[model samples]
Target: GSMTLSSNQYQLPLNVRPYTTTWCSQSPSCSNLLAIGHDTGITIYCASEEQTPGSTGLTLQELFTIQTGLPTLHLSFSSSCSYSENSPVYSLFLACVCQDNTVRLIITKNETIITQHVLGGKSGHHNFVNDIDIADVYSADNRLAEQVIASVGDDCTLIIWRLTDEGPILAGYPLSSPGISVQFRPSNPNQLIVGERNGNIRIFDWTLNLVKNPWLLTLNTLPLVGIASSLANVRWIGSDGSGILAMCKSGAWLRWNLNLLPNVQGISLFPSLLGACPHPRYMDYFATAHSQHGLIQLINTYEKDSNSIPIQLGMPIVDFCWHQDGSHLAIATEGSVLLTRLMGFTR
Candidate 1:
């Protein structure tokens, strides 16, 4: 059987340069605010309401822009920014991973940078900083109190830091295998999950130091080359409200539910789907970007029982994110940003 698809596409302003690899948006509102990073630098984009595709007069306008001289390769928002809990006045924390193995933290409100933190230096990783996460794994009651940022680099090491006035407290975890990705379990913010370049997944409890090994389990018998996780992944090791985790190696999707603990409930090996990015919302939904062209796919996590259609956007997707409510999706590709809203559904 064949599937039907429809999309509303809006291109970013010409002044906005194309991103080298990745980009991220923290909120689900059509505010047109985004943190964009590339091989050269990082900048913020504020779009006018009128520029937005499905807007009445709300064009996507470019508001404020800040340039970090480092080449930014990866980006992620702080977990606290998801639900508007901590620092309600401040809604966005942009973690920009740089080529020099450093992470630049930019705090923004209404698309304005209020504070900035340049973390990691010579004492940090020796290679490129590939990924970063602001996890909540501390005390259940005070979980959000302690802000923990985990970063992975080409050096094959994962470093956890406590954001404090004295600066980041380094909790280094050297890996036997080089790690490319690192994340804290959403439900159990104190728990750490790491993915190595060799295709292995390791779980750790940050509250309890490394008295014993934190290697809880492994994914495929075959080495996992790439990995990503959110509540969307059925085998995720976080709490019930945590987001899904989606990972890929050789262009296959391996999803796990963080609340399930050591058990994977669903697996989708899409050979053609090269990369995926999950919206922060806790649902069986994620967007996958292909390597060849600007093609994007919206997947339904709950459609495991029946053969359901996947949402497809025919655009080269470098990186993407869903707004807080999962209504609008923002994508970066072809040196431009594209925004689309879920119209309804296709039969």
Candidate 2:
């Protein structure tokens, strides 16, 4: 069977297959920046206005590429502006988990990208690191904008770091099993959502302390006993920060309240989960990329009847990201990365 991309999608010009992709949440001045991570390096691209005749909208253009000499498993960015100088200088900080069990930090300065720190050593994770996430924190006066990093590893450790000019202050926590994924709650930066291989979804405070007991959701009708049962992703449902969505490798997911709703909340499965992103504005809606169907599924968790749209891709989706403002979505596959405008998403 022949497969083709949709008319609304635009393929990026690249010879390398992306392992992971993230849309940079930099300042509005630095908008439309997409970071694509591959085997040996990461490339940043920006959407610019087309200059040709009869040009209508923006087109993607490569901005810069940074070589790390290792595969990046996950990538995330935090933006801050430095105003000591006459003109405001925006600092875009990127944290990526590398194959060597280390986390590399890079900062974009004066339109140039450079590595700022390599955050692994004697104190880092002893086993392979699986995921990494970054969030920005502000002081009461709003003068101090600090970036906090959270990462999980196969070593069954959750590491937290505070970015500083001197260096990052590190704190580590031991989990019951291998940590699968970690994400900072958008509504409350101090709250973190962590998924473990023991079929447990945990909430931890920014101080690296467990907020409550492990919330267990059965996977594939199996008891939440062994390390074989794992979560692919566990994240806050939306910007509300009161609910979360957790998915296992079997594509089964559970939606429940942050207050540790009962395990009997029931189970819902998707085609084949690769990644999912909560809708920026819609609290009850989200999108999931399917590994088997080669499509993006738009779902309304609150709606009962079954209102879903499977946006066709015709190729297995490995990863995908939603724009901060719900503007566009970038989907990564083995062949290339495709971008599409989510028309008619506005209410």
Candidate 3:
């Protein structure tokens, strides 16, 4: 039997240069905003009320643009945001890493963008900053909160910053090899996960101190059993954040349960796997893209034996993100951003 497929797709305004990275706004107040990073700046688009030529859902409208002076390597939206009570004005913090060896903090206030602070220089990473992640931590009562930012760079240093009105406080840790990726655990923001160019992954506390135990268990070789190839990127998957997924530049990936890391499972996807991102709502599904084929593979990692559902867009995907509501998927390839309305998949 063959399965029939359809999608409501629209292409955003073409970019003069190719897109570097993409991120979707996570706050419910502005979840429809899609940010695309490029050589000179980042362009933000909002899902507008206007429908596409012959499709359903909303079309994309260029919302705002920010020129960074230097190329942005990565972009992330903070968990903390503010909205005025009887007005439409909303604000959110965005952290981005650039080739200038710095993490730039930008805040959006209504219709304008403000570059609040830059964190990195003489006391920061000496080389290029590769990745950055922002997370919000709340108190026991869940009333008060603060944002914690983490970033890794090519100089083998991992830096953690605490955001404050005055400025950002910082802490840096030197690594054995250049750090490729760093992310704060969603389920437990107190812990951080870092991947290195030498195929090593480590767990660290929010303060930049390494966690000796390695997750929940005391399995000596558990979380430390990194692959032989370079660990290009990593992200904590699943709604509960119980799984760790890392993909190497060699196209090999490893999956491990947070508590039972000894039973690691993985497979090689033919050496051109660009990147992968977990589904926003469905914990079992994830999208993986290839560098040459332009095929987006929706793979069910939960099933013991599952085949991927491929969607061809005719160009290699540079970056992509799923809307917070899981209703839309935006993909960046070459000069254009492709937005598609997803349906028929189990919620």
**Per-model lDDT:** 0.55, 0.67, 0.67
Q: How large an RMSD does model 2 have?
A: 4.8
Q: Which RMSD values do the candidates have, in order?
A: 5.8, 4.8, 4.0
lDDT by residue for model 1 over 1-347, one digit each (tens)? 12442333445546555553332332344234556675545555554445536543223444444556556777776644532435433356666677666776777664456888777666677777666777543343654455677787768777777775455677777775666667666556666667665556677666664423555555542332234332111124223434435455434455554343422334443433333456545456655555345555556665654333344445556666655445555666755665555543210
- lDDT by residue for model 2 (197-311), tens: 6667767766433433433332222342122344677777655677777666655556665433434332334543454577777766677666666766676675644435546
**In order, how many clashes per candidate?**
50, 0, 0
In model 2, pairs of residues that clash are none
- Per-residue lDDT tens digits of candidate 3, residues 1-347? 11234444445445445455454555667677778777777777777655447555657777666777667778898765555656566576788877677887788775467546787668677887778888877777685366777888878888888775445677777776778888888667888788777766777765433432333321122244333455667777766678777766665566677553433545434343454577777766667776566766666665544545446777777777777766567877776777665655423
Give the lDDT of residue 53 in candidate 2.
89
- Between candidates 2 and 3, the TM-score winner: 3
Q: Model 1: which ten-residue window has the lowest total lDDT?
A: 229-238
- Candidate 3 Cα lDDT to native: 0.67
Q: Candidate 1, TM-score vs. the true structure? A: 0.72
Q: Give the TM-score of candidate 2.
A: 0.81
- Candidate 1 global lDDT: 0.55
Model 3: colliding residue pairs: none
